[PDB]
Short mmCIF file of C-alpha atoms and ligand atoms in Angstrom, two decimals:
data_model
loop_
_atom_site.label_atom_id
_atom_site.label_comp_id
_atom_site.label_asym_id
_atom_site.label_seq_id
_atom_site.Cartn_x
_atom_site.Cartn_y
_atom_site.Cartn_z
CA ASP A 11 118.28 106.37 107.55
CA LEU A 12 115.75 105.77 110.41
CA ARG A 13 117.02 104.72 113.81
CA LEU A 14 115.30 102.13 115.98
CA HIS A 15 113.96 103.18 119.45
CA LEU A 16 112.54 100.37 121.64
CA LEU A 17 109.66 101.67 123.62
CA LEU A 18 110.72 103.09 127.02
CA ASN A 19 107.53 101.47 128.47
CA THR A 20 108.52 97.83 128.16
CA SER A 21 105.05 96.68 129.14
CA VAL A 22 103.91 97.73 125.69
CA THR A 23 105.05 94.55 123.81
CA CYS A 24 105.10 92.69 120.57
CA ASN A 25 103.26 89.37 120.59
CA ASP A 26 106.11 87.37 122.28
CA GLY A 27 106.41 90.13 125.02
CA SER A 28 109.53 91.66 123.67
CA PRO A 29 109.48 95.53 123.60
CA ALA A 30 107.59 97.15 120.63
CA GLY A 31 109.32 100.18 119.24
CA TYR A 32 109.66 102.72 116.35
CA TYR A 33 112.21 103.75 113.81
CA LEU A 34 112.80 107.56 113.75
CA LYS A 35 114.53 110.14 111.58
CA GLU A 36 114.11 113.64 112.82
CA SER A 37 113.85 116.67 110.56
CA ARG A 38 114.26 119.55 112.83
CA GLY A 39 113.38 122.19 110.25
CA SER A 40 109.92 120.51 109.90
CA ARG A 41 106.59 120.63 111.82
CA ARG A 42 105.28 117.67 109.82
CA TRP A 43 105.37 114.17 111.25
CA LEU A 44 104.58 110.93 109.30
CA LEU A 45 103.87 107.96 111.46
CA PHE A 46 103.66 104.86 109.19
CA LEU A 47 102.02 101.57 110.41
CA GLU A 48 103.67 98.54 108.69
CA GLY A 49 101.39 95.75 107.39
CA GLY A 50 101.50 91.93 107.23
CA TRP A 51 98.17 90.06 107.63
CA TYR A 52 97.42 88.83 111.28
CA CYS A 53 96.76 85.69 113.24
CA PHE A 54 93.62 84.82 115.05
CA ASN A 55 94.22 81.60 117.30
CA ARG A 56 97.12 79.91 119.12
CA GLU A 57 97.64 77.46 116.26
CA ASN A 58 98.19 80.05 113.49
CA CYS A 59 99.99 82.47 115.72
CA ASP A 60 102.45 79.60 116.68
CA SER A 61 102.95 78.94 112.94
CA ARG A 62 103.61 82.62 112.23
CA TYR A 63 106.05 82.68 115.15
CA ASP A 64 108.10 79.99 113.61
CA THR A 65 108.62 81.54 110.19
CA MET A 66 107.37 85.22 110.42
CA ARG A 67 108.95 85.89 113.75
CA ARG A 68 109.86 89.56 113.01
CA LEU A 69 106.11 90.18 112.78
CA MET A 70 105.82 88.95 116.29
CA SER A 71 109.00 90.00 118.04
CA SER A 72 111.56 92.84 118.21
CA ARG A 73 114.41 90.52 119.27
CA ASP A 74 115.90 90.38 115.74
CA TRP A 75 114.98 93.92 114.56
CA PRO A 76 117.90 95.84 112.83
CA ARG A 77 119.25 98.93 114.29
CA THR A 78 118.37 101.09 111.27
CA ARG A 79 115.99 101.17 108.51
CA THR A 80 116.01 103.09 105.08
CA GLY A 81 113.08 105.38 104.57
CA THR A 82 111.51 104.54 101.08
CA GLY A 83 108.59 105.91 99.09
CA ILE A 84 106.63 108.38 101.28
CA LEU A 85 109.16 107.73 104.03
CA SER A 86 112.04 108.89 101.74
CA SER A 87 113.77 112.24 102.60
CA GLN A 88 114.88 112.57 98.92
CA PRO A 89 112.75 114.97 96.93
CA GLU A 90 113.01 113.00 93.73
CA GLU A 91 111.69 109.77 95.46
CA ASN A 92 109.21 111.73 97.69
CA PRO A 93 107.89 115.00 96.13
CA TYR A 94 105.15 115.10 98.81
CA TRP A 95 106.82 115.06 102.40
CA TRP A 96 110.57 114.57 101.75
CA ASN A 97 111.34 117.04 104.60
CA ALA A 98 109.06 115.64 107.20
CA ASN A 99 109.88 113.81 110.49
CA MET A 100 109.70 110.06 109.62
CA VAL A 101 108.56 107.37 111.85
CA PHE A 102 108.22 103.68 110.86
CA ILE A 103 106.28 101.56 113.40
CA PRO A 104 107.01 97.87 112.81
CA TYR A 105 104.01 95.61 113.01
CA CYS A 106 104.74 93.07 115.65
CA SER A 107 101.21 92.49 117.24
CA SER A 108 99.41 90.57 114.41
CA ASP A 109 96.08 92.18 115.31
CA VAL A 110 95.47 94.72 112.56
CA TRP A 111 96.60 97.29 115.08
CA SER A 112 93.47 96.81 117.16
CA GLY A 113 94.61 94.85 120.28
CA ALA A 114 94.85 96.01 123.86
CA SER A 115 95.57 92.86 125.84
CA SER A 116 98.69 91.93 127.71
CA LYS A 117 100.52 88.60 127.76
CA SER A 118 99.60 86.78 131.05
CA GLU A 119 99.43 83.47 132.79
CA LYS A 120 96.42 82.82 130.66
CA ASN A 121 97.28 84.48 127.33
CA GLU A 122 100.03 82.88 125.13
CA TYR A 123 100.58 86.05 123.24
CA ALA A 124 100.08 89.84 123.68
CA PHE A 125 98.07 91.78 121.19
CA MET A 126 98.76 95.50 121.86
CA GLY A 127 98.79 97.26 118.42
CA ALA A 128 96.49 100.09 119.54
CA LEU A 129 98.51 100.51 122.71
CA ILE A 130 101.65 100.45 120.69
CA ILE A 131 100.49 103.43 118.53
CA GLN A 132 99.43 105.33 121.59
CA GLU A 133 102.66 104.77 123.36
CA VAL A 134 104.81 105.67 120.30
CA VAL A 135 102.89 108.97 120.03
CA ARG A 136 103.51 109.59 123.79
CA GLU A 137 107.29 109.06 123.59
CA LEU A 138 107.49 111.09 120.40
CA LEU A 139 106.04 114.12 122.12
CA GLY A 140 109.36 114.50 124.02
CA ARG A 141 111.30 114.20 120.71
CA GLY A 142 109.76 117.12 118.88
CA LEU A 143 106.16 115.91 118.17
CA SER A 144 104.85 118.44 120.71
CA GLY A 145 105.61 121.25 118.39
CA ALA A 146 104.06 119.58 115.24
CA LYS A 147 101.60 121.25 113.03
CA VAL A 148 100.40 117.95 111.20
CA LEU A 149 100.59 114.31 112.28
CA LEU A 150 99.81 112.05 109.36
CA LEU A 151 99.15 108.55 110.48
CA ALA A 152 99.81 106.40 107.44
CA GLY A 153 99.84 102.65 106.92
CA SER A 154 99.74 99.88 104.26
CA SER A 155 97.55 96.80 104.00
CA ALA A 156 96.84 95.68 107.63
CA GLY A 157 98.54 98.99 108.44
CA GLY A 158 96.11 100.75 106.29
CA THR A 159 93.29 99.34 108.15
CA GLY A 160 95.15 100.22 111.31
CA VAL A 161 94.96 103.87 110.23
CA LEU A 162 91.28 103.70 109.91
CA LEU A 163 91.03 101.89 113.37
CA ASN A 164 93.32 104.39 115.28
CA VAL A 165 93.45 107.78 113.51
CA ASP A 166 90.66 109.21 115.66
CA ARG A 167 91.96 107.68 118.88
CA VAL A 168 95.30 109.55 118.14
CA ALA A 169 93.47 112.80 117.69
CA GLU A 170 91.57 112.34 120.93
CA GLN A 171 94.69 111.20 122.77
CA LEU A 172 96.58 114.41 121.72
CA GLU A 173 93.52 116.57 122.63
CA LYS A 174 93.30 115.15 126.10
CA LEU A 175 97.08 115.46 126.59
CA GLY A 176 96.79 119.19 125.84
CA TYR A 177 98.00 119.42 122.21
CA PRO A 178 94.95 120.96 120.48
CA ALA A 179 96.97 122.43 117.64
CA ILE A 180 98.36 119.21 116.22
CA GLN A 181 96.14 118.26 113.24
CA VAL A 182 95.85 114.49 113.10
CA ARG A 183 95.05 113.03 109.62
CA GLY A 184 94.96 109.59 108.10
CA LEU A 185 96.48 108.01 104.93
CA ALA A 186 95.14 104.46 104.59
CA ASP A 187 97.01 102.52 101.84
CA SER A 188 95.62 99.14 100.58
CA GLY A 189 93.51 98.79 103.68
CA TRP A 190 90.11 99.29 102.25
CA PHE A 191 88.70 95.82 102.10
CA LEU A 192 85.30 94.36 101.02
CA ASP A 193 83.46 91.80 103.05
CA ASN A 194 82.20 90.23 99.82
CA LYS A 195 81.51 86.59 98.99
CA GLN A 196 84.52 84.53 97.79
CA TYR A 197 84.88 83.49 94.18
CA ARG A 198 85.02 79.94 95.49
CA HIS A 199 83.90 78.80 98.94
CA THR A 200 86.91 77.70 100.77
CA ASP A 201 86.78 77.11 104.40
CA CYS A 202 88.50 79.33 107.06
CA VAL A 203 91.23 77.12 108.39
CA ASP A 204 94.48 79.31 107.83
CA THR A 205 94.70 83.09 107.47
CA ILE A 206 95.13 83.82 103.80
CA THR A 207 92.34 81.65 102.41
CA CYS A 208 89.98 82.52 105.13
CA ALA A 209 87.02 84.76 104.23
CA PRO A 210 87.52 88.29 105.67
CA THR A 211 84.31 88.45 107.73
CA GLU A 212 85.06 85.29 109.83
CA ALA A 213 88.72 86.27 109.95
CA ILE A 214 88.01 89.51 111.85
CA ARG A 215 85.20 88.12 114.17
CA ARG A 216 87.53 85.40 115.55
CA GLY A 217 90.46 87.79 115.69
CA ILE A 218 88.77 90.51 117.72
CA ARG A 219 87.86 87.92 120.45
CA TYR A 220 91.39 86.56 120.51
CA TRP A 221 93.11 89.91 120.53
CA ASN A 222 90.62 91.79 122.63
CA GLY A 223 90.35 94.21 119.68
CA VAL A 224 89.05 97.68 119.76
CA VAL A 225 87.37 99.79 117.12
CA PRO A 226 86.40 103.46 116.74
CA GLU A 227 83.73 104.59 119.25
CA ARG A 228 81.09 105.90 116.84
CA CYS A 229 81.43 102.90 114.65
CA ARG A 230 81.23 100.59 117.65
CA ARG A 231 78.02 102.34 118.70
CA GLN A 232 76.43 101.66 115.31
CA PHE A 233 77.17 97.98 115.10
CA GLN A 234 77.01 97.18 118.85
CA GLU A 235 78.15 94.21 120.85
CA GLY A 236 79.36 91.20 118.90
CA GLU A 237 79.31 92.99 115.53
CA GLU A 238 82.51 95.12 115.99
CA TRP A 239 84.18 93.28 113.20
CA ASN A 240 82.21 95.38 110.87
CA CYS A 241 84.46 98.46 111.68
CA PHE A 242 87.47 96.68 110.21
CA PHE A 243 85.90 97.35 106.72
CA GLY A 244 86.70 100.73 105.38
CA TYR A 245 83.35 101.52 103.70
CA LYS A 246 81.69 100.94 107.08
CA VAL A 247 84.11 102.59 109.46
CA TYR A 248 85.19 105.60 107.33
CA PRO A 249 81.81 107.49 107.51
CA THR A 250 82.14 107.56 111.33
CA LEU A 251 85.55 108.97 111.36
CA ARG A 252 86.19 112.68 112.33
CA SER A 253 89.81 113.14 111.33
CA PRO A 254 90.49 113.73 107.56
CA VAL A 255 91.56 110.41 105.93
CA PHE A 256 92.98 110.06 102.42
CA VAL A 257 92.19 106.57 101.03
CA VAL A 258 94.61 104.83 98.55
CA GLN A 259 93.29 101.61 97.21
CA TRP A 260 94.02 99.46 94.10
CA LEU A 261 90.72 98.62 92.69
CA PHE A 262 91.96 94.98 92.37
CA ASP A 263 94.04 94.49 95.47
CA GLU A 264 95.97 91.32 95.37
CA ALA A 265 95.20 90.68 99.17
CA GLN A 266 91.40 91.14 98.44
CA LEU A 267 91.61 88.61 95.59
CA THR A 268 93.50 86.16 97.85
CA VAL A 269 90.85 86.23 100.57
CA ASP A 270 88.22 85.96 97.68
CA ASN A 271 90.11 82.89 96.46
CA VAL A 272 90.94 84.39 93.16
CA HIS A 273 94.26 83.39 91.44
CA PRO A 278 92.63 82.19 80.43
CA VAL A 279 89.89 84.00 82.33
CA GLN A 280 86.43 82.46 81.68
CA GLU A 281 83.02 84.32 81.89
CA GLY A 282 82.45 83.53 85.61
CA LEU A 283 85.77 84.93 86.77
CA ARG A 284 85.62 87.83 84.43
CA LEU A 285 82.17 88.86 85.78
CA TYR A 286 83.39 88.39 89.49
CA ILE A 287 86.42 90.55 88.92
CA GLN A 288 84.46 93.25 87.09
CA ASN A 289 81.86 93.26 89.81
CA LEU A 290 84.63 93.54 92.43
CA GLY A 291 86.12 96.78 90.76
CA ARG A 292 82.65 98.27 90.42
CA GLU A 293 81.71 97.53 94.08
CA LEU A 294 84.96 99.13 95.25
CA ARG A 295 84.45 102.08 93.10
CA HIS A 296 80.95 102.41 94.51
CA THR A 297 82.37 102.47 98.09
CA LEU A 298 84.73 105.36 97.21
CA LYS A 299 82.21 107.55 95.52
CA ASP A 300 81.58 109.51 98.74
CA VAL A 301 85.32 109.51 99.92
CA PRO A 302 86.47 112.94 98.72
CA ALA A 303 90.23 112.38 99.07
CA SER A 304 91.07 109.13 97.34
CA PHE A 305 93.54 107.60 94.91
CA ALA A 306 92.21 104.21 93.43
CA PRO A 307 93.77 103.16 90.22
CA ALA A 308 92.43 100.15 88.09
CA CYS A 309 95.38 97.91 88.83
CA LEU A 310 95.98 94.38 90.13
CA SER A 311 98.74 95.08 92.78
CA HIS A 312 99.44 95.12 96.50
CA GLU A 313 100.37 98.17 98.63
CA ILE A 314 102.09 101.34 97.23
CA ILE A 315 103.11 104.19 99.41
CA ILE A 316 106.56 103.00 100.66
CA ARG A 317 107.63 101.47 97.38
CA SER A 318 110.47 103.47 95.75
CA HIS A 319 108.55 104.01 92.54
CA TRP A 320 105.27 105.03 94.15
CA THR A 321 105.43 108.26 92.07
CA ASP A 322 104.82 106.30 88.91
CA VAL A 323 101.18 105.51 88.88
CA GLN A 324 98.65 108.12 87.71
CA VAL A 325 94.79 108.52 87.76
CA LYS A 326 93.34 111.11 85.22
CA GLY A 327 96.88 112.38 84.68
CA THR A 328 97.57 112.99 88.42
CA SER A 329 100.19 111.17 90.54
CA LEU A 330 99.56 110.16 94.10
CA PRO A 331 102.18 112.56 95.53
CA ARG A 332 100.47 115.37 93.68
CA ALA A 333 97.08 114.18 94.85
CA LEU A 334 98.32 114.17 98.49
CA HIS A 335 99.70 117.68 97.97
CA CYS A 336 96.38 118.95 96.69
CA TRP A 337 94.79 117.21 99.78
CA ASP A 338 97.22 119.25 102.02
CA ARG A 339 96.17 122.38 100.26
CA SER A 340 92.48 121.57 100.62
CA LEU A 341 92.97 121.42 104.46
CA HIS A 342 94.47 124.85 104.86
CA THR A 350 85.89 124.48 97.49
CA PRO A 351 87.60 122.38 94.65
CA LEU A 352 91.12 123.58 93.67
CA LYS A 353 91.86 124.54 90.08
CA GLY A 354 94.25 121.81 88.66
CA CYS A 355 94.76 120.16 92.03
CA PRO A 356 92.33 117.35 92.12
CA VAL A 357 91.82 115.08 95.27
CA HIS A 358 89.30 112.54 94.22
CA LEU A 359 90.92 110.21 91.77
CA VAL A 360 89.02 106.92 91.16
CA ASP A 361 89.60 105.01 87.97
CA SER A 362 86.36 104.05 86.06
CA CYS A 363 87.71 101.39 83.67
CA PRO A 364 86.57 97.99 84.60
CA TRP A 365 89.60 95.61 84.34
CA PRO A 366 93.15 95.29 85.89
CA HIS A 367 95.79 97.43 83.91
CA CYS A 368 93.13 99.45 81.89
CA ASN A 369 95.13 102.18 83.44
CA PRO A 370 98.37 102.13 81.55
CA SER A 371 100.39 103.54 84.41
CA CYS A 372 99.73 100.40 86.57
CA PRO A 373 103.00 98.96 87.99
CA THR A 374 104.42 95.87 86.27
C1 LIG B 401 103.14 101.46 130.45
O1 LIG B 401 102.22 100.63 129.81
C2 LIG B 401 101.25 100.04 130.67
C3 LIG B 401 100.52 98.95 129.80
O2 LIG B 401 99.74 99.59 128.71
C4 LIG B 401 100.36 101.02 131.14
O3 LIG B 401 99.47 100.40 132.14
C5 LIG B 401 101.18 102.12 131.98
O4 LIG B 401 100.22 103.26 132.19
C6 LIG B 401 102.31 102.66 131.08
N1 LIG B 401 103.20 103.57 131.81
C7 LIG B 401 103.11 104.93 131.79
C8 LIG B 401 104.04 105.53 132.73
O5 LIG B 401 102.33 105.45 131.17
C1 LIG B 402 94.96 90.86 103.76
C2 LIG B 402 93.95 91.44 104.73
N1 LIG B 402 92.60 91.09 104.62
C3 LIG B 402 91.92 91.76 105.63
C4 LIG B 402 90.38 91.63 105.62
F1 LIG B 402 89.96 90.43 106.02
F2 LIG B 402 89.83 92.48 106.51
F3 LIG B 402 89.83 91.76 104.52
C5 LIG B 402 92.64 92.51 106.26
C6 LIG B 402 94.07 92.32 105.73
C7 LIG B 402 95.07 93.17 106.48
O1 LIG B 402 96.30 92.57 106.42
O2 LIG B 402 94.79 94.22 106.87
#
């Protein structure tokens, strides 16, 4: 099990100002460190953050967090459940900033909520250095859904943080699970009122303003003032990243379909869904380390049965091990680019049920 540690710097807070924190299980015989960013959507104005505080409070506050957490999937220490990194140091960073891990603004006389996700990551990494991270050889920043986008927004800043702190030998890498979204047109044109039905583009634009959200420097320099929302979209931010990033993405992510207003499938919907899979496949063509099965599902890497799905006969744990090997061109029998080509949910027979 992983043990909670509330951040020693209590000015780094969840939305309601309670301390943010992390769950840790040390593996002293290991120089590998897995820092996992939890997911869970976001909120982008006082009204919808107030509603989320009323019935999703754990995503906004540490006041009710349990003392321990079981590591599952890629965070499991059992080899049968986690053939990839069962022996690593395991860190689970609860998501309590509702800002897709982008914020850097404190709660004040003028701000009802704090949005500090990016400062949370930075501070966790700092306090971990004194608990063994300083000796690490690889730090894999991983994350699912909003945490998957968080990886893309933060992996390079973590690299740069550790460099400026004097730890050049720690290799920072990213594993973005289910955080590779398309800013496409919705199937039906609902209006952005809440957070689920809202279109992705308008969601992020309002959010950044409200959170004081920050994005990777090189991506920021491309899109420039006002257009930083662009960097929340994997296919636009990924090419600007310097750290190695493995991308895991269902071709038909349920959260993508939700924001696209997709729920007897007639021609119009069949075409829309097939176009979505092809567009997603297109954006992954030049991502050399990726695992993108043709399934309708949400998230994967901390589910107990994440070992089950395969693309072209290769499991995600195997693909991640081949990726490790590639970073010591293509390896014999150890493929790293695994993107399904069939065009409909569950044409891959290993899709979860
Ligand atoms: C604690 O966090 C605050 C807010 O980000 C920051 O200003 C300060 O530098 C941190 N303290 C230390 C000792 O790093
Ligand atoms: C469900 C979801 N949609 C988006 C969007 F708008 F960028 F596509 C981000 C998330 C997330 O939780 O990270």
